[PDB]
Nucleic acid binder design. Sequence first.
DNA 1: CTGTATTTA
DNA 2: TAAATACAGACCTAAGTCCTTGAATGCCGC
DNA 3: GCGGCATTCAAGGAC
Lengths: 258, 340, 319, 337, 327, 255
Amino acid sequence: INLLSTISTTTKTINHENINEISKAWEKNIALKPFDIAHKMLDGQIYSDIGSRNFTLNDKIALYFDDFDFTPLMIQENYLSTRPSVLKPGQSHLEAVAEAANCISLGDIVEKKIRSSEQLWSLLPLHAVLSSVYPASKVAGHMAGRINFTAWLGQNSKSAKYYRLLQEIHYHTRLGTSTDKIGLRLDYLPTFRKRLLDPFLKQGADAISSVIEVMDDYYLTKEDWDSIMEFFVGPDVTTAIIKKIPATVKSGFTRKYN
Amino acid sequence: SKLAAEQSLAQQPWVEKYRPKNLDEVTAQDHAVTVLKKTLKSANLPHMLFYGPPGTGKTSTILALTKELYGPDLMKSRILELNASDERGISIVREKVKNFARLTVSKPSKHDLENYPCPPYKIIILDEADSMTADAQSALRRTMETYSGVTRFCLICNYVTRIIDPLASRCSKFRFKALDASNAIDRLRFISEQENVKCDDGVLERILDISAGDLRRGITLLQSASKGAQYLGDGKNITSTQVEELAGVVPHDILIEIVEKVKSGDFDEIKKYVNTFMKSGWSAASVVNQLHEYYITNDNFDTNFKNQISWLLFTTDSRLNNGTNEHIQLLNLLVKISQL
Amino acid sequence: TLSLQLPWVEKYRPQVLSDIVGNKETIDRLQQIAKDGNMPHMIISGMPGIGKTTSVHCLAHELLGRSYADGVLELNASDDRGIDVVRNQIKHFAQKKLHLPPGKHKIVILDEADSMTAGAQQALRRTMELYSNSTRFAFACNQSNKIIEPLQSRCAILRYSKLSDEDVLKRLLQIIKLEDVKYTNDGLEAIIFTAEGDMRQAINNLQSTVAGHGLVNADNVFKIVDSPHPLIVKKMLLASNLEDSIQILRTDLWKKGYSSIDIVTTSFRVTKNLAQVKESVRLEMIKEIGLTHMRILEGVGTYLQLASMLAKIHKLNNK
Amino acid sequence: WVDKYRPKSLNALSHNEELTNFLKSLSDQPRDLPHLLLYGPNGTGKKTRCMALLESIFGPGVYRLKIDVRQFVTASNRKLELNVVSSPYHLEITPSDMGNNDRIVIQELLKEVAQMERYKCVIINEANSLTKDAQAALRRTMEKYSKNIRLIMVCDSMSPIIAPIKSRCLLIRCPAPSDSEISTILSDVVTNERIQLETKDILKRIAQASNGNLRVSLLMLESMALNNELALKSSSPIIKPDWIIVIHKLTRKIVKERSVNSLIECRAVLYDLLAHCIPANIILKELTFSLLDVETLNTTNKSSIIEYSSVFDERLSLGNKAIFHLEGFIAKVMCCL
Amino acid sequence: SKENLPWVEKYRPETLDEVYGQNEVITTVRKFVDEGKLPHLLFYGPPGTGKTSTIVALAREIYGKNYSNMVLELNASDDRGIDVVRNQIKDFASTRQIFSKGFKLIILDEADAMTNAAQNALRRVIERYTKNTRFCVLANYAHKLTPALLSRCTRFRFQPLPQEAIERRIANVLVHEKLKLSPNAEKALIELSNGDMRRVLNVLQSCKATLDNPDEDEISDDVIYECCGAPRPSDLKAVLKSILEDDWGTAHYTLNKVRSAKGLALIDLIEGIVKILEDYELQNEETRVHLLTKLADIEYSISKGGNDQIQGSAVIGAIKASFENET
Amino acid sequence: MLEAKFEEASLFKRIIDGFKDCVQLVNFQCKEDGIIAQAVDDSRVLLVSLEIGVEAFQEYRCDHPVTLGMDLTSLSKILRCGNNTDTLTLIADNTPDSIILLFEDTKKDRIAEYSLKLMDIDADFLKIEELQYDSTLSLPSSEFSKIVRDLSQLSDSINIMITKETIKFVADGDIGSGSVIIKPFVDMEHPETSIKLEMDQPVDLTFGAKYLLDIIKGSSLSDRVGIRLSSEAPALFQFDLKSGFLQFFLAPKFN
DNA sequence: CTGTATTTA
DNA sequence: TAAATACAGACCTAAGTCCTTGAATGCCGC
DNA sequence: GCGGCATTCAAGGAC
Ligand SMILES: Nc1ncnc2c1ncn2[C@@H]1O[C@H](COP(=O)(O)OP(=O)(O)OP(O)(O)=S)[C@@H](O)[C@H]1O
Ligand SMILES: Nc1ncnc2c1ncn2[C@@H]1O[C@H](COP(=O)(O)OP(=O)(O)OP(O)(O)=S)[C@@H](O)[C@H]1O
Ligand SMILES: Nc1ncnc2c1ncn2[C@@H]1O[C@H](COP(=O)(O)OP(=O)(O)O)[C@@H](O)[C@H]1O
Ligand SMILES: Nc1ncnc2c1ncn2[C@@H]1O[C@H](COP(=O)(O)OP(=O)(O)O)[C@@H](O)[C@H]1O
Ligand SMILES: [Mg+2]
Ligand SMILES: [Mg+2]
Ligand SMILES: [Mg+2]
C-alpha cells in the first residue's frame, strides 16, 4: 500500500513496462534465515559462470554476514550431504569434501583467532570465505536429502555437561586417585565399572556391601555412581545393562546408600 | 635489615641469588648498559623498549638501572612495575597508568641527593608487553608522549613484533643479545667460583652451549649439577656428560641409533623405534636440535639433501612450537627425512 | 587571519528540490509530494555524498514553509539513539498540537538512522503508528539493512544510487560559473574520476584545489588529491609478471607510506569485487591474502610478507 | 590397586634409580631449591615422585591433604568455582578444569599465598592446558616471590609450555619404566593381593600392552582379575578401554570403505567420542597410530597419513572446535587411501 | 628545562618552518591558513612522519602562544567514546572562544582507534557545526575510518621523509649539540631509518651516550652499528657470498661466526638479505617465488620463537634451494 | 614552606564545591599575597579564576611561590572529612609534593591529618582579563540560581538580554517557552536584595544551560553575584568573597 | 532441502 | 484428494571493549 | 521522613 501511494503521485498508471525499476528499487533486503543461507550457499547454479556473473562473491560474503554465528556451523554440518555439480574433471566427491574440510579447518583457526584475545574482528571477511564460501564452492551442487540444522551446539552442551559431571567425580575421588581428570576418565573408569557394576551382574544382590565399601573408600555417591555408567561408549554401553539388572538389586542398593 | 636480606639471598636459588644489582654486573649487554650508565650522569632517559630472547637479563638490567638512579628508598616510591600477572586492559591503562603519570614525582629526602643522581622523573616498567592488547598499546602510545617530562616508560618484551609499530617508534629499541659461551663464560665462571663449584675444563662452556643464549637456564643447570655433585660427596669434578644427562640432552649413542634407523630401515622399523624412544620421555625440541646439529655439521651429505633436511627440521620445529604432540611430529620428521 | 568563509559544500548547498542533480525519478517524486502534500513515511538510503540529507531538508522546507521551526524535529539518530529519547521527546513532539495547513504535517527527520539502537528502533513503531495522521517520519541512512524490517514495513523506501558523471559535471560547471574559477577539462575529469560518484567529495576537492593552486588542472588535482588507492592495488595484483607487481608494491605503495594493513585490506576488497578472473582463482587469491593479513595482524607486517603475497598470487596464476 | 600399593617416600620408589638419586640430591638442601618442571610420558608416576620429594623436603604429614572451595570473579562478573588441594606444607592447583579463565586463577590466588607468607610448595597439575596468557601471568610471579613460593609443574609434554616458563624452572624428565621393572611391580602387587598366576610371563605381556604406562598396567591388571576370578591363565584376554575399541573400529571402517557416506558415520563416531569426556589430541594420536598398524597399507600411504596427522595436530592446537579438524584429518586420510 | 627531555621530544618542531620532509603539504596548509580557507584536514601517514608536530605548529601559528587553551585536542589516551563526543565536541563546537575571536580547532589525534558509533555521531557534528570550527583527524591507518567520515575531510598523505630533509634535520641537531657525524655513518643512519625521524633521534642520542668521551671524537659507522645492533653491509654481503658459492659447512660456520661475533639478530640479517637480493637480476620468477615464500615463512616463525640455529640453517637452505633453480 | 591557617574550615569546602562539577584539575599558585587558581573545563567552554587573599587566612606563611597541581574529585572528599566547627591548615614543603591538610577542633582536642598527592599539570594558568564590558549588573545569588534552575528544565540554551533597565532570561524548548523579566530596583530596607544595573549598550546572547547550572553552584559563597556582559566577549559571573573573589568567564554560543 | 499446515482445486 | 505455495526446522560458549539501559545505590534538598 | 535527582553499575547486545 505504501509503494502504491508513493509511486502513483508521479506515474498515474503503472504497467508491465516500468515494473522492473519498481521492483528493483523496492526489493526487500532482509537477512535470510540460516536454513535459507545454507540452501543458497550450497546451490550449484550459483557457482557457475552465469551464477558467478549474476550472484557475485560480494553477495556471497553478504549472505554469510546475514548470520555469521551459524553459517559456518551449518556449512560444516551439511556440506558432505550434497550431490555435487561443480566437480573438476578428474576429481571425485571424496577429494572435494577433503578440500572443503581443509578449508573448514582454516576457517575454524581464523574464527578462534577472531573470538580470542586481541579481538581480531577485522578478520571477519576472511572467516566469510574460509568457513562458508570456499567449502560450499568445493562441494556445490544439489541437496541430496534435507538440510539438517547444525548438531555441534547439542554435542557441545552434552560434552560440557559430561565434563562437569567428570569434574565432580574427579574432585570427589582425588583423595585416592591422585590423577588428573583425563587420566581418571581414560583409565580409572574401565576399572570402576568392573568394580561397581560387574558384581551386580555376576553375584546378584549379595554384592551390595562390597560395592558400597568400594564407593565409600573413594567417597563416591549415588548420583556419582549414576554418572559413572554414562561415560562408557562403544561395545560397553550401560543404558541397557542397568535395566537388565533386577529391580530388587537396585532397590537394595538404594536402601543401603540411604 | 641488611643482614636479613643477605641471609635471604644466601638461602635463595642461584638465579635470584646472583641477580645483577648494579649496571656493572650485566656482562654481555654492554651496548645497552653503556647508554644506561651515561644517562645516569645526565637526566635524559628516553622511553625504552627492551627486546630479545628469554634469559638475557632485561628485567635485571632495568632493575639495576632503577636502583642506581633512585636508591633503595625512592625505588619503592618512583617506580611503577606492571607485569604480565596484572590486568592491563584499556580501562587499566587509561585509569591507573595515566593517573600515575599525571602525578608529580615524589620529593626525595636529604640522604638521596648526596649519594644518587635523583632525576626529576619517575619510571613505569611494563614487563611482558606481548600480552597487552593493541588498543591498550595505543592508549600507552598517547600517554607516553604528552607526560614525558615527569615519567619515563620502559616496555620489556620477548617478541618485538607483538607491539604496534608506533609504540616501537616512540621508544628507543634495545636488543638484548643471545648469551652464548663467549660473552657469558666469565659470568658462569664467577658464579661457579663463588659457590666453590669444582668442575672440569669444558663444563661451563658446554652448559652455555646447551643453554642456547639463555643465562637463566645455564645458571639453573650449574645449580642442579652442583647439588648433584655435593650429594655424592665423592670430591671429584662435574663432568660434561653429567651436565647433559640432567639437561635433557639425548645421549650420542641413542642419536646415532636414530641416524642408522633413518638411513637404513622401512616405515615399520622407524615407527617402532619412535614408539620405544618416546618411552624415555625426551623433549622433542632437544631431539630436533640434535638432529639438526648432526646433519648440518656432518660433511657426508649432499647439498640438495642439506636444503631439504634444513627445511624439514624448520617445519617440524615451527609445528612443535605451537603446542603439538611430540611423538607425531617426531615420527613425521623421521619418516619424511627417511624418504630423502 | 581573523575568519574563514563558508565551504562550497554549505555555501552552494541546494535549498530547493530543483537544484539537486541526483536521481531524476525520486527527485521528481519528492517535488510532486511537496506540491501536493500528504508526505508519507520514508527512508532514504544510498552512499555518502549523493544528496540524501539535502533532499530531505529541502523537502521539509518546501513542505512546511515558515512553519519549519515549529514543525520539523531534526535529530541525528547517532546523536540521539536512546529508547528514552523516543519515549519522551519524539513522543511529546508527535502528540504536540500544531495548527498546520490542511495538506502539511509535522516532520521528524532522523539523520544517520542506521546507528539507532534496537530498543529505540522497536519503540518507534507504535509511536509512528498511533500518531501517523499528524506526524511523519523521514529516515536518512547509508545501509537499509541496519533498520529493522517492521520499521521499513511502514514507510516508502528510496534507494539512491551513485551519481552519473554528467550530473556531477553539470553541478561542478554551475559552481565554477557561480564562483569564477579558472579550470581545465582535464582537471574536471580528474575531479570526477577521484570523486567516485560522491558529489560532496568532488565539491570539497574542487574547493581545496582552487584554494591551494588557483587553477583546476589535472596536474594540480593529482598533486593535491592522490589517485584512488584501490586502483593501484588492482593494477598490482593483475600484473602478468612478478617483477612488475613487486615494482608497483615497492614504489607506489611501500615507498609512499602506505601501511601494510591498509595494503592487505585493499587487496582483500579488490579481489572480493574483482571480475576479470574466475571464481576459483578469486577465492584462492582471497585465501592467500587472508593468510597474509593474519600474519600482518600479529605485528609481522613488513615488506617481505607483501612480497610473499604477490609471489604466491603469481604462482596461483601460473596454473 | 592404583592407590593401595603406591610409594610414599623416595626410598619406597622401585624404578628409575638414577631419577631417585637425582631427587635425593635435589632434596638434600631443600631451602636452596629452584622451581621444578616434571615432564615425561603419561602414567609414568611423576606425580608420585613429586609427592615423595615433598615428603622428603617436609615431614610425613604432606599426604594428609584436604579439598577446599574458592570463588573467583572474572572480567564478566562470573562466579568461577575452583576446588583446591591443600596441605599444611604445600598446595595443588589444576587450572585445566576451566576454559580461558585460567590466568585469573593463576594471578590472584598465588598472590594470596605469595603475600600471606620457610616456603609453601605449589603444584601445577597438567601445565599443558595452561593458556599462553596464564603462562605469561605466571612468568613474573615465579620470579618476584621466590623466597615464599616454589612451583612444581607436572606435565606430559613441554611442547605447549612457552620458553620463559621452561627457562625459569629446572627440567626433570621421567622416563617410562622398563618392561622388566613394570613386571616386578606387577609381581609384587599380585603376591600381596593374592592373585594366582600359572606363569609369570603374563605379567610381562601386560607391560607390552601398556606402552610403558604404570597406571594403565595396574588398572589393566585389575580389569584382568575380575573376568578370570583372581586367577590369570595362559590365554587371559587383554581388556582394552572402551574408547580404544571404538577408535580401532573407526580405523577398520576407514581402511575398509572410503566415501562420504562412511564419512558421515565417522563424523557420528567422532561426535560420540568427543561428547564423552575424551580429548581430541588423544583421539587423533590413537587413530593415527592404529591406522599405521594396518598391514594393508604401504609405506607411501603411511607417510602421507603421518604427514596429515601432524598437519591437523597443528590445526587442532591452533583451533578450538575439535570435530572441525578431526573430520578434515579423516577426510584427507580417506583421500590418501 | 628542555635539556632534560629526550632528543625525540627535545627537538619537536614548534613552527611550521621546522617541519621537514613534507613540502607540497606544508605550503598548501600555509596558503590555506593565510587566505583563510582552512577546510577539515585528515593527515594520514606512517608513524614519525610529523603529523602531530605540524598540526601543533599550525595551531600555534593560527592562535598564538595560548594554543593550549583555544584548541580542543582529543586523543586515543582519552575516552574516545560516543558520549564523550556528544558532550565535549558538541559543546566546544557550539560555544564561542573564551580568549579571543575566531574559529575553533579540534585535533582528533590517533582517531583511527575511535569507535564506529563515535565516528557515526561525529560525522553529523562536523557537517552541522562547520561555520565556526574545523576538524583535524590524524591517522596512521585509514581503513579504521568509516567512508562517510573519510569523505568529509580533505586528505593529506604524509610521505616518509626523503634523504635531503632528514639530513637537514640531523644537521640541525648536530648544530644544537656539540656533536659530529661521519658521512658514511650518516648514510647508514638514514638507511636504518625507513622515514622515521623518531628512530633517528633516539639512536642519535643513544650513540651520543655511547661515545664514552666528552665529544671531541666523531661518530663513525661502527658506533652507529654497535649501538643500534644492525648488521654491517660488509657482513651482509659476506654472509650472502658464503651462502651463495661456499660449502654448506663453510656457509654455516660463516653465518654462525658473523652472528655471534657481534651478537647479531637473525631477523636483521634476514631483512638485509631480502633488501640486498631485491636488486639481483634473475632470469625467471620461480626462484624469486620460492625465496620470498620461504623467507616470509621463516620470518613469521622467528616472530614467535623457536630454535635459532635451526632457523638460520633454514634460511641458508631456502636461499640455496631457491637459487638452485637458476641454472 | 607553605603554611596557611583558615578562619573556618568550611569556607574552603564551600569554595571547592563550586568547582566540583565544572573543573577536574587545578593549579593553585601560592604567593605572598594569597592563593590564585585558574582552570578550564574539559570542553573548554568556561574558565574559573579564584583568588583568596591573606585576609581569609588566620595565619599565612609563603617563603617562595609554590605550584600545587591537584585533583578536585579527591580534595572534595578530603575536605568532607572535616567538621562544621573545625579549622583547616594547609601545609606544603619546600618542594611541592603531597599537600597536607590538618583539621583541628576549637572546642575539643582532635587532630585530623590528611594527605593529597600532587600532579604535574603542564599547562600554565596566569592569564588575566581586564577589559570594559557593555553591561554590569548585580543581583542576589539565590534569585539568579532560582531563575537558572527554573529555566534549565525548558531547554538546554538560556538567552540573556540586557536592555534599558530591563533584564530578560529567555528559554525556548520542545515542551514550551519561558521568559523572566526583571527591573533594577534599590531596596533600602535590605541592601542584599536590591538589583543594580549599569548598561552602556544593549546585549543579547545565549549560553548553555548545564554550564549555567554549574556556575550557580557557587551561590553558597556570597549572597550577591555580579554579572558582566559584553559583545563578542566572555561573560563574567563573580562571587565576591571577604578576602578575594571567584569569577567564571563563560563563553556564549554561536548564533 | 524434507516435511507439514493451509488453502483451493 | 489432490495441486500450490508457504515455510519451518534451530539459537554457543569462554573471551576483549564499547554501548545501552534498566535498576539499584547514593546523596542532597526539603 | 520522604521526594527527587544524579551517579554508578551490571546485564545484554554488537563488532
Ligand atoms: N646479562 C646478565 N648478566 C648477569 N646475569 C644475568 C644476565 N642475564 C641474565 N642473568 C641471570 O639470569 C637471571 C634472570 O634474568 P632476567 O632478567 O629475569 O631474564 P629476562 O630477560 O627477564 O627473561 P624474561 O623475564 O623471560 S623476558 C638473573 O637473575 C641473573 O641471575
Ligand atoms: N617532518 C619532521 N620534521 C622534523 N622533526 C620531525 C618530523 N617528523 C617527525 N619529527 C620528529 O619526530 C617526533 C615525533 O613526531 P610526531 O609528529 O609526534 O609523529 P607522528 O607523525 O604524529 O606519528 P604518530 O605520533 O606515531 S601518529 C617529533 O617530535 C620530531 O622531533
Ligand atoms: N545531487 C546533488 N546535487 C547538488 N548538490 C549535491 C548533490 N548531492 C550532494 N550534494 C552536495 O553535497 C553536500 C552535502 O551532501 P549530503 O546530501 O549531506 O550527502 P548525503 O547524501 O551523504 O547526506 C551539499 O552541500 C550539496 O551541495
Ligand atoms: N616407584 C614406583 N614404584 C611402583 N609404582 C609406582 C612408582 N611410581 C609410580 N607408581 C605407580 O604410578 C601410579 C600413579 O601414577 P601417576 O603419577 O598418577 O601418573 P602420571 O605420572 O601420569 O601423573 C601409582 O598408582 C603407582 O602404583
Ligand atoms: Mg623479565
Ligand atoms: Mg547525511
Ligand atoms: Mg601523533
